[PDB]
């Protein structure tokens, strides 16, 4: 189907407590597969999915080199950003970067990404053309000018169109047992009284992969969006996800309510009701 690969990076300065903490993880779709944490003893990038473990020692050596260089680049960049925002060296600040690519079912590039944020806000982002930039403020315009002079967009475009897609396709083949398997949600409806007059109907979806899912409650066939409590989809810890949606219904009208489940793992969408 469609698929993605992303590398996420965070540096957090901690003045008076040594160098910034640096953590990066890589994902294919919703599957974590590599990690690097600067505060580990002798830090190396480590595998987190079985299908990456077969990469040879040269692969881990080059990945670790990249992780360490990015940490060091972030350390300098955090000092730069203190100048650009006229900030003190006393406080803790955050630099985040994400990049990666999306491919379609034929394995063709759909979209590439590379974006940076400072202290939780947009700083500078490569546009979807992979050739121009969006700078969020006059500080990021300085970076933009530097990155235009240096033709950074062209270098990123070459990676996103080439290696990014090539390697994602390799990962997809090598982990096809799990990466190309959708686990449908296991579903049920629970009923919990809140008084003599109403009760919560809660529609559960457990054990599913990938995380994308739609849960909706209807009453007599009409969506209950404004009446529906819907928790963020959350990780089970074993690669799969969980979600639920709830509505408060008048006691005795439970059979008017249906829960609708759409998931890539499902033959067809499900319709569930509370079953006493």
């Amino acid at each position: 189907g469609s698929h993605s690969m992303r590398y996420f990076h965070t540096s957090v300065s901690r003045p008076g407590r040594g160098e910034p903490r640096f953590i990066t993880v890589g994902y294919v779709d919703d599957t974590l597969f590599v990690r690097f944490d600067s505060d580990a003893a002798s830090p190396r990038e480590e595998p987190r999915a079985p299908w990456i473990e077969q990469e040879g020692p040269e692969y881990w050596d080059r990945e670790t080199q990249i992780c360490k260089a990015k940490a060091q680049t972030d350390r300098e960049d955090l000092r730069t950003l203190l100048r650009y925002y006229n900030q003190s060296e006393a406080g803790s600040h955050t630099l985040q970067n994400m990049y990666g690519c999306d491919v379609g079912p034929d394995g063709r590039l759909l979209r590439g990404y590379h974006q940076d944020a400072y202290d939780g806000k947009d700083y500078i982002a490569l546009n979807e053309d992979l050739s121009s930039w969006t700078a969020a403020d006059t500080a990021a315009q300085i970076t933009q000018r530097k990155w235009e002079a240096a033709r950074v967009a062209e270098q990123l475009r070459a990676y996103l169109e080439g290696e990014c897609v090539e390697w994602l396709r390799r990962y997809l083949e090598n982990g096809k047992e799990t990466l190309q398997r959708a686990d449908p949600p296991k579903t049920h409806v629970t009923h919990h009284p809140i008084s003599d007059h109403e009760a919560t109907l809660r529609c559960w979806a457990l054990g599913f992969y990938p995380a994308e899912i739609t849960l909706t409650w209807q009453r007599d066939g009409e969506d209950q969006t404004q009446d529906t409590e819907l928790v963020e989809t959350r990780p089970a810890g074993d690669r799969t996800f969980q979600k639920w949606a709830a509505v408060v219904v008048p006691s005795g009208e439970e059979q008017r309510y249906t829960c609708h489940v759409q998931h890539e793992g499902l033959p067809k969408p499900l319709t569930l009701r509370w079953e006493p």
């Binding site: 080059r62 990249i66 992780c67 990015k70 680049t73 960049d77 650009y84 530097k146 290696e163 990014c164």
Partner: peptide, 9 residues
């Protein structure tokens, strides 16, 4: 696999 970052802010 990763892309080496060769640029500064």
């Amino acid at each position: 696999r990763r892309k080496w970052r060769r640029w500064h802010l």
